[PDB]
Amino acid sequence: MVVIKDIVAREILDSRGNPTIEVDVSTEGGVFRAAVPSGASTGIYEALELRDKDPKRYLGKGVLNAVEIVRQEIKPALLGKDPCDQKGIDMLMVEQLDGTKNEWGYSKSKLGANAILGVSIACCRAGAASKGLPLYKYIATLAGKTIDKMVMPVPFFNVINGGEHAGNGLALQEFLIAPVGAPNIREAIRYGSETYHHLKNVIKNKYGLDATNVGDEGGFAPNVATAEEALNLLVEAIKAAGYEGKIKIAFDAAASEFYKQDEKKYDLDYKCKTKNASKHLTGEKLKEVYEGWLKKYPIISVEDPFDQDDFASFSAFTKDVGEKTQVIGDDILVTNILRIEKALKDKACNCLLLKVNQIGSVTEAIEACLLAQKSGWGVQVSHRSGETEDSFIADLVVGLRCGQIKSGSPCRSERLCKYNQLMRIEESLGADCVYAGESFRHPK
Amino acid sequence: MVVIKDIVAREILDSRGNPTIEVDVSTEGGVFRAAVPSGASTGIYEALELRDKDPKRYLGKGVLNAVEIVRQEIKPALLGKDPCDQKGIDMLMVEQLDGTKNEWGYSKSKLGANAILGVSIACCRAGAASKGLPLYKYIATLAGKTIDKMVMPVPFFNVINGGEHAGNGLALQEFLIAPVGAPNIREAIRYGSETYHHLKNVIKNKYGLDATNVGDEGGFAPNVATAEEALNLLVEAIKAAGYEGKIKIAFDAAASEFYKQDEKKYDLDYKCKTKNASKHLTGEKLKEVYEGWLKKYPIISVEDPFDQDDFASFSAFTKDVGEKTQVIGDDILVTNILRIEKALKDKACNCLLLKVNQIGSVTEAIEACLLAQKSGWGVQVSHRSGETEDSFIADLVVGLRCGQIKSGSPCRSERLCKYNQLMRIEESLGADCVYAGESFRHPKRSH
């Protein structure tokens, strides 16, 4: 039995040089810290983070107002409370102290999702200490999962970039590699790292040294015009690295970015100077293109294949490929219960991309994960473009028994601290853990 | 008081995706962790790392051997010792357990510079805890410096890359910006981040979206042909940010990369295809070229202006710039006492670039810093190309009261990791600390 003795927040910088919020919760057991990744300050479905909007500081991206919220609103309301009452603390902040609710659920507009999550994670971390348990086992406790035979997740490393993250012709946003065939996660990380360096070398020699400079998530943005060229580089790299058959491929289309709202078309050539009518596809036809790549390449997962509001296409694609392939819903679900329930009723997808700061609290993150799992869906915990030194999602993925996680390329320490944390988790557990492997989407 | 109960180590990944060692020293006061950055497994001056060299694991960069060394050689030797005796522990490893050496001091080859530094830093963290002091203050007591009016360092952020780190025409390796005009470290960081983003979008318009991708240290590699083109971008970036006069420039030439041994001349166009742009320059002319830029642009520091062994030039350059510009030694010194002493005698520099894993231990890192400081030189704590999420050098630079630190651009968390740590330290100390500012070369004393 411990209680919240103090709560102080501060402004720190995320992986991209932009301010983010870090919180320190104190109990008789010590000081507990949590740093929140970056999200969206404006939006219609997701939880909005509070930013100063002062052009004279950090180009308007400061979080001082957020720091003051924690001190002036959240602190006085939590002093004396038991940090182990995760649900009580999260619902107090979200429903009572804030209460700002849009038509899709609580927005967390007044206090800001960033201020709330910071406290939620810090209390969650203080609670684990109060119970004398490592973070991963404590999360499992909150989710109703068991603390033995915990599943280590399959990591999804970003490798090739397109869409709005590159000047190349590639329309899809991300191409990743996933070592499902590794015996354990420490090896999974090696397979990933080696294949990644091999790919770097290939790019260095073909596209030049400057093409080996990385993007926000640590991936490369070589001058490839089509998905086929991207997919070809990956298969060559995997084979050359010696992991043919042990490392699979996955991609994030981010189709919303190339969707033509009125005519209801998807323009695979939205970046090309000379436009081709043959590439302005309807949902049903875009589907067939993906189905073409699935039979030709070892693709095991597809994220945001269509616009965030095109449930028709999602449903059709999932109906055709759902059994043997994973269809992740990111922008379409936005880690939102109501959005998920609608997806479930329409069988839009079969996997939830879980961005914790997108929903705002740990309790809400957990219920969303549980809803997906109870419905037969898989769950992939995700990082953000703007991450931090905090490895929370690493313990989260293990505690929620997802057996699946994408947290960037094996490059840039905001991505690696998560992967490093997973390896420590694995040592600690030792024989008391198993690797998701081929069962990443539905762990045993 | 408390003693060492156990020492373990594991293999983690550094910022470039290469393995490195992480050590956990345990006492009754808890478990203390330390991760070391990348170094070099070969060289004739510096402390050498121990790499597995296994053709089939991590391209020969594994560190399982280093991890086993800690377990079978170090651990048994340290169990029961007080973690506070930093010097006793550091010398037990460097001189007795290891003992290997070259004509420039102990190399730390048998146990590995990485295994020893990992242990040294972990114990240092355990010692701080024993004494009941934050790591930075504990380091101050080891260096024999006061813990009352501590000094925050001026940060040197990487911004434009060249030489071997870029396919562009720029011969110099790094260009940095330093907010000497900021009132405190948190402001210095803001100034840096703002100027960095202003630079980012200037580059975006003139070179395109791909040109904004970052290198190992978070900086950019725009296709600029000369130093003049690079300096103009920085001047422009600084003015757009509104910090003209408050943010100065610095650069690391890494001149060794463009020195022609056979000719004994430097080539600023060594990357150009056609090789007749301009004749190669001697130390003399190269100096004049730098002095030329010192008048043109607000450059306050120059690192590795000449070849790793060209003391004649260094001396000549340091002599006529003297009090108005900082001249850092990196490759020429390689954080080696005996090298520092030769450079001191020859007046080759007026500042030391301190790379803690290059010398091997915290104790040696401290005497190196103390040797520089008491001889009229500055000390600039530095990061490595391959960093980790360990913010140790943040507390080191504060504890040593250096007044200056380079730890990458305000991009990539292995870099922000250190900058964020400096801001926490500043909060902790509150009204009980000062910003080096204008005095970054030699922080003013307290009275």
Residue numbers in the entry:
A (entry chain A): 1 to 444
B (entry chain B): 1 to 447
Original paper wording:
In addition to playing a primary role in metabolism, enolases have evolved an impressive range of ‘moonlighting’ functions. Toxoplasma possesses two enolase isoforms that are differentially expressed in a stage-specific manner. Enolase 2 (TgENO2) has been shown to be specifically expressed in tachyzoites, whereas enolase 1 (TgENO1) is solely expressed in bradyzoites.
An apo TgENO1 crystal structure was determined in space group I4 to 2.75 Å resolution. The crystallographic asymmetric unit contained three nearly identical TgENO1 homodimers. The TgENO1 structure reveals that the two plant-like enolase insertions are located on surface loops. The larger pentapeptide insertion EWGYS forms a short β-strand (β5) between the α3 and α4 helices. The dipeptide insertion KQ, which is between β11 and β12, also increases the charged surface potential of loop L3 in the C-terminal domain, providing a possible site for binding to ligands that will negatively regulate the catalytic pocket. The interaction of the N-terminal domain of one subunit with the C-terminal domain of the other subunit forms the TgENO1 dimer interface that buries 1891.7 Å2 and contains 33 hydrogen bonds and 15 salt bridges. Most notable in the bradyzoite TgENO1 is the presence of Glu164 at a position that is most commonly occupied by a serine in other enolases.
